[PDB]
Amino acid sequence: ETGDQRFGDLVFRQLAPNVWQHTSYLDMPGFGAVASNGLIVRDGGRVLVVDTAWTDDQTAQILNWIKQEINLPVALAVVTHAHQDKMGGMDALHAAGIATYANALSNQLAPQEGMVAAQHSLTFAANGWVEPATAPNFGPLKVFYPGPGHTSDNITVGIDGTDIAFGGCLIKDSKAKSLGNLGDADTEHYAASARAFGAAFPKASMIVMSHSAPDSRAAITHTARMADKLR
């Protein structure tokens, strides 16, 4: 924490001239305070958001920080899988008038997970890249579905014009001890999905992820190696 800004419970860190990481925390029984990170991207006269915070109230804090500090309208948000860390604050996005997008499968799973679905569904080609007609006006956000991993619906995003790719919850940092897979993880394909993400954004040198500070491409290698052992 040096250069980090705080708004309420949220912490913000600039990653590049037009990119910030948002971080919110949830106190959990064993882990203590657990961070969830997402991204804010300034793209011309508009802002794009990747992932909510854990809660609606935390997510409203992101939006108020954007309003106060960047002062540009948030055009859209994309959420990266249907669990509370990434979709917990959908109601706040909706109340703010923001158009929301998620993988079709995330929207299908959302009711079962107790999450609110996004307003729009992204679909993907067989090579993993988003169908452009389902992601209109996404500017520099390049959305890629790497295959099943943490969940069957997890997606990732690269930011054109930067060194940054965001693996969301599929990628763990190079010091992580395990993947924390539950019954919805696909342990057969996890390693291939982590490598696919690596291959989709081969020029990214800063890997942003949900539960650790940004890492090098070591995070991708490490995640894939740990996943190799789940087979």
Ligand X SMILES: O=C(O)c1cccc(/C=N/n2c(S)nnc2-c2ccc(C(F)(F)F)cc2)c1
Residues at the interface with ligand X (CB under 6 A): 26, 28, 31, 34, 83-85, 150, 169, 172, 180, 210-211
Shortest Å, Cβ 106 to ligand X: 12
189 is in an annotated binding site: no
Are 198 and 216 in contact by the 8 Å Cβ rule? The answer is: no
- Nearest-angstrom CA–CA distance, 104 and 81: 10
Count of residues of this chain found to bind Ca ion when the rule CB under 5 A is applied? 2
91 binds, options Ca ion, Zn ion, ligand X, none, Cβ within 5 to 8 A by partner type: Ca ion
- Nearest-angstrom CA–CA distance, 62 and 36: 13
180 binds, options ligand X, Ca ion, Zn ion, none, Cβ within 5 to 8 A by partner type: ligand X
Are 79 and 118 in contact by the 8 Å Cβ rule? The answer is: yes
Other beta carbons within 10 Å of 106: 28
Are 213 and 222 in contact by the 8 Å Cβ rule? The answer is: no
Give the residue among 163, 231, 184 at the shortest CA–CA distance from 81: 184
Does 91 contact Ca ion by CB under 5 A? yes
133 binds, options Ca ion, ligand X, Zn ion, none, Cβ within 5 to 8 A by partner type: none
Q: Residue 95: phi, psi to the nearest 5?
A: -65, -30
85 is in an annotated binding site: yes
51 is in an annotated binding site: no
Does 56 contact Ca ion by CB under 5 A? yes
169 is in an annotated binding site: yes
Structure tokens at 177: 């001890």
Does 173 contact Ca ion by CB under 5 A? no
91 is in an annotated binding site: yes
Q: Which amino acid is at 210?
A: S
Residue stretches of the annotated binding site for Ca(2+): 56, 91, 113, 184, 188
Residue stretches of the annotated binding site: 56, 81, 83, 85, 91, 113, 150, 169, 184, 188, 211
